Amino acid sequence: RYAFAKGVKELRFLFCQTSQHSAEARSFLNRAYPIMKKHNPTIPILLREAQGTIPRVYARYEFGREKMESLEGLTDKQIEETVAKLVKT
């Protein structure tokens, strides 16, 4: 629940609408996104979904650098910690 480093240009969350994968990414976004968009209001947090999409998260850094992390088989708490690594330094 804090603003990310100055490197974070944007966040991208990709997930699906069904229960093929878990609902942990959806529950996590249900909670995380309002407070994450709150504390630092100028960071594009793109939530893009599509049928059959494995959960992932992308973090854009400076000059076009990106890191992706798979959220499959991961509970929301681990999803919460997975994002924490991508955003704190």
Which residues of this protein are in contact with other proteins, per CB under 8 A? 9-10, 12, 14-17, 26, 29-30, 33-34, 37-38, 41-51, 53, 58, 60, 62-64, 68
Tell me the one-letter amino acid at 15.
F
Taking the complex as a whole, the smallest distance from the CB of residue 39 to other proteins amounts, in Å, to 12
Taking the complex as a whole, the smallest distance from the CB of residue 65 to other proteins amounts, in Å, to 9
- By beta-carbon proximity to other proteins, the closer residue of 44 and 73 is 44
- Note whether 24 and 75 are within 8 A (CB): yes
Taking the complex as a whole, the smallest distance from the CB of residue 62 to other proteins amounts, in Å, to 7
